[PDB]
């Protein structure tokens, strides 16, 4: 049933309310997602002026329901099976030798639009570090996100390291711990072990005055033998 909502192009709305070392900010975005091809695009706008953290640190917080699951892996798509009622996606993101984010998102259908509504809190960041100091490049590396079942909570879990390029020429690791839990309580698909393959391109709208990020992701489930 849930997969039947993702046979075409689906409109997206993203809303984030954030607070990092007490600095409050708000992000609003809309775009389109195409789970048949495992593709999505968003224009994400800061509605509160210049962001207090670099846009790349927010990429993972700002839609796993749009992964393309190959035809032989269809019974392992927890994310679509939880729709239309949706799921809660919660993370801790720990920045190497710096502070951490905690996020709670709700991913669900409102009308015919897929909404990702997020509350983010960032704690213990250093004023001269890479995040509050804006020393991260405006780009994004490709990553594999391994997905496991969480029977106890009727959901899935994931942990993965994000590599952020630093302006000097190094890398800063962002350690992600993730838990997804259904919002309703209909049956969902609990998956065998697999991973999602992510590729992301960050860009800018040359005609937009506000602080913003154009995000294009391509996502493919993989890792199940036959």
Numbering used by the authors: 3 to 64, 68 to 231
Can you quote the paper on this entry?
We report the rational engineering of a remarkably stable yellow fluorescent protein (YFP), ‘hyperfolder YFP’ (hfYFP), that withstands chaotropic conditions that denature most biological structures within seconds, including superfolder green fluorescent protein (GFP). hfYFP contains no cysteines, is chloride insensitive and tolerates aldehyde and osmium tetroxide fixation better than common fluorescent proteins, enabling its use in expansion and electron microscopies. We solved the crystal structures of hfYFP (to 1.7-Å resolution), a monomeric variant, monomeric hyperfolder YFP (mhYFP) (1.6 Å), and a cysteine-free mGL variant called FOLD6 (1.2 Å), shedding light on structure–function relationships underpinning their brightness and stability. Through structure-guided engineering and screening based on GdnHCl unfolding kinetics and melting temperature (Tm) alongside rigorous spectroscopic characterization, we produced a series of avFP mutants demonstrating superior stability over sfGFP in diverse biochemical assays. Each FP crystallized as a monomer with no asymmetric unit.
Our structure-guided screening efforts produced a YFP, hfYFP, whose stability in notoriously chaotropic conditions, including OsO4, allowed it to survive CLEM sample preparation with fluorescence retention matching mEos4b’s. hfYFP also showed strong resistance to aldehyde fixatives and performed well in ExM. The spectral properties and performance of hfYFP in cells —having similar excitation/emission maxima but lacking eYFP’s 405-nm absorbance peak —make it an appealing replacement for eYFP. hfYFP exhibits faster chromophore maturation, fluorescence intensity in Escherichia coli equivalent to mGL’s and greater than the other GFPs/YFPs tested, 33% greater brightness than eYFP and 2.4-fold greater brightness than eGFP in three human cell lines, greater pH stability than eYFP and insensitivity to chloride. Intriguingly, instead of dimming, hfYFP grew 50% brighter in 6.3 M GdnHCl. The data provide further evidence that hfYFP is stabilized by GdnHCl even at concentrations that rapidly denature common FPs (and almost all known proteins). When measured after 12, 24 and 48 h, hfYFP fluorescence was unchanged relative to its value at 2 h. Whereas sfGFP denatured instantly in 7 M GdnHCl, hfYFP persisted >3 months in the same solution at room temperature (RT) (inset photograph). The melting temperature of hfYFP (Tm = 94.2 °C) was approximately 20 °C and 14 °C greater eYFP’s and eGFP’s values, respectively. hfYFP and mGL can tolerate higher temperatures for much greater lengths of time than the other FPs, including sfGFP. We tested the same FPs that we compared in the other stability assays and found that none could tolerate OsO4 concentrations used for CLEM except mEos4b, hfYFP and mhYFP.
